Design a binder for this molecule. Structure first.
Ligand SMILES: Nc1nc2c(ncn2[C@@H]2O[C@H](COP(=O)(O)OP(=O)(O)CP(=O)(O)O)[C@@H](O)[C@H]2O)c(=O)[nH]1
Ligand SMILES: Nc1nc2c(ncn2[C@@H]2O[C@H](COP(=O)(O)OP(=O)(O)CP(=O)(O)O)[C@@H](O)[C@H]2O)c(=O)[nH]1
Ligand SMILES: [Mg+2]
Ligand SMILES: [Mg+2]
Lengths: 330, 340
């Protein structure tokens, strides 16, 4: 179904452009937040469906990465800071992000508030904006300033305070949920949980004799949108270049076999997280369309009853309305 | 060995009692700080040498436990709130701590700043004050107030602000050290690191492909006194009643077999942390002795001449003799301590 909606939405956005009006679906942006090493970058790139974000132990993401997915015929990527070049090898994209980070922050744990801008072109994506962010901390290391914690907090606040921004509150299972930096920030900016999606990672690392059932069932710390558990690649896995299909296969096996979670399998995992996020995106689209539809109808009526040689407007509006109708039918 | 100093020290504090002076030997108060579930209660009871602190997953320690070790030959324990009762079964002590907590906090995650006073009598301990505290958190659960983080923080602050408080900054290895609540707290109250000891737990739970070598080698986040790693019992271990000896054996085996920690094995483990903590305690005592000795000498010398004439010339004021002997006794004990 998603494969049918995506191409229609791109057509509608183009149609709006032809109309030359300040009207857009205003798709919400996706931001990932949480304590350092919570597993944020893994979560984000999994949603996009490509291995391109630097991941590792310790401090990895040291600058915000503003990613704009752009629907296009060709599949490639390009950074704003690299005018001209078109990356087709995503490993090179990952390497470039790292290199661009080191260039500005150095290699002694430093951080920078300056975003790395990346556009990923593909015909199977929504024109979305996703933001990868540095993890929250408590004490400075290397050459970080004494107030590193607040410099990072400020950094993510500028993204998560944006209206409608979908907040991926990432928390590792091998730590008590009550210590979640992700949830604390989420509750400050979105207290009612209207745009917070709880994500519990590292389920495979829990101490023997423990499990996150109460968390995953949305009972330990209830969230309006609930919680979705995932099991991503470990350091040994990253070191060994384990591929995505294999990681996803291991995650699926994990939920189907674990005695504390198999009854929840159908609501756990990376693929299911993708569906949940895509659903929230679809909900925004369908919720925003009626207002636009009516506006376009009003604009059309004027020219329609009157039917400057600007006859194009009639067809442009007519086109947009035809697309909306198709979307409403899916 | 430490078991040599202990007997001497108690006799010293007793000698001062006979003299009616300030026994002193103001030993530092040891407190465990860290995020919720960092493994504080395990570390604390491991140092005491007995299993009696409630440990488990989720929120366990919901009230401060001010524990006073009291040297005594009978070896037992008594709670201030259990007037007239003395426990001999430390497991019953553990149950009581939990029961007493439930009585005031309920069973729905609630906490209370009202400390639980407990005294453990044993001939293998120094008159110390240990403080078990609730783990720091960020978001409330159950019927905890929305300011749970600060109530817990304030609870700890009442103990760790004291100049004479030895801070055991506990942080689990399977979490990033830079995000440690224990280290944030410790740095705020003791920036120089004069009374902070970094304890790293759960090294056995680290992700495959990672290790805490840089941490344990005092290189990632250097502390004045460094770090000591330990491997305590897991939840499964608690459920299975795994005994202390087995846990200790597994911990030692862990450091000796791990390629990243092998060369550090001799500066790692619970027995080592016990030694290090004991060293700081002993050092405090030794720093205090010169002052006490001098004070005693001055007092002695005064009556010394009076005793001299009493034993040599023709004949109650014999309170002097009692004092003479008590003072002599104390100085001798100090002398014995000085020679270790
Ligand atoms: N076992 C296991 N390891 C995981 C899981 N998710 C992430 N990791 C590991 O945790 C570490 C952090 O991964 P990463 O995706 O970079 O988290 P991040 O929060 O983006 C890191 P930073 O906060 O520095 O940007 C890596 O070593 C990765 O292999 C998981 O579900 N299971
Ligand atoms: N595998 C493993 N588990 C550990 C280790 N230390 C503690 N745990 C586990 O962590 C949990 C918490 O232990 P606890 O000693 O209560 O930590 P605490 O910080 O005192 C808990 P609170 O903050 O509620 O008081 C228990 O399930 C225990 O088995 C360790 O070194 N290894
Ligand atoms: Mg990251
Ligand atoms: Mg405890």
């Amino acid at each position: 179904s998603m494969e049918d909606l995506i191409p229609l939405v791109n057509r509608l956005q183009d149609a709006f452009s032809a109309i030359g009006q300040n009207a857009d679906l205003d798709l919400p942006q996706i931001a990932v937040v949480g304590g350092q090493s919570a597993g944020k970058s893994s979560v984000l790139e999994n949603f996009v469906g490509r291995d391109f974000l630097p991941r590792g132990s310790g401090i990895v993401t040291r600058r915000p990465l503003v990613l704009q997915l752009v629907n296009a015929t060709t599949e490639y990527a390009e950074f704003l800071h690299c005018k001209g070049k078109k990356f087709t090898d995503f490993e090179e994209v990952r390497l470039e992000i790292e290199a661009e980070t080191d260039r500005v922050t150095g290699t002694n744990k430093g951080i920078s508030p300056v975003p790395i801008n990346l556009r990923v072109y593909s015909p199977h994506v929504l024109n979305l904006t996703l933001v990868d962010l540095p993890g929250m901390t408590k004490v400075p290391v290397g050459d970080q300033p004494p107030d590193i914690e607040f410099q990072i907090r400020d950094m993510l606040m500028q993204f998560v305070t944006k209206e409608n921004c979908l907040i991926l509150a990432v928390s590792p299972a091998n730590s008590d949920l009550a210590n979640s930096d992700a949830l604390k920030v989420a509750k400050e900016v979105d207290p009612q949980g209207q745009r917070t999606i709880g994500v519990i990672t590292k389920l495979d690392l829990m101490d023997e004799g423990t499990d996150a059932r109460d968390v995953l069932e949305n009972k330990l710390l209830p969230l309006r949108r609930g919680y979705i558990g995932v099991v991503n690649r470990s350091q040994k896995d990253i070191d060994g270049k384990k591929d995505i299909t294999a990681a996803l296969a291991a995650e699926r096996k994990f939920f189907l076999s674990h005695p504390s979670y198999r009854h929840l399998a159908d609501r756990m995992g990376t693929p299911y997280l993708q569906k949940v996020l895509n659903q929230q995106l679809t909900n925004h689209i369908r919720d925003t369309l009626p207002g636009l539809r009516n506006k376009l109808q009003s604009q059309l009526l004027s020219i329609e009853k009157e039917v400057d040689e600007m006859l194009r407007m009639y067809h442009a509006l007519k086109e947009a309305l035809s697309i909306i109708g198709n979307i409403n039918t899916t």
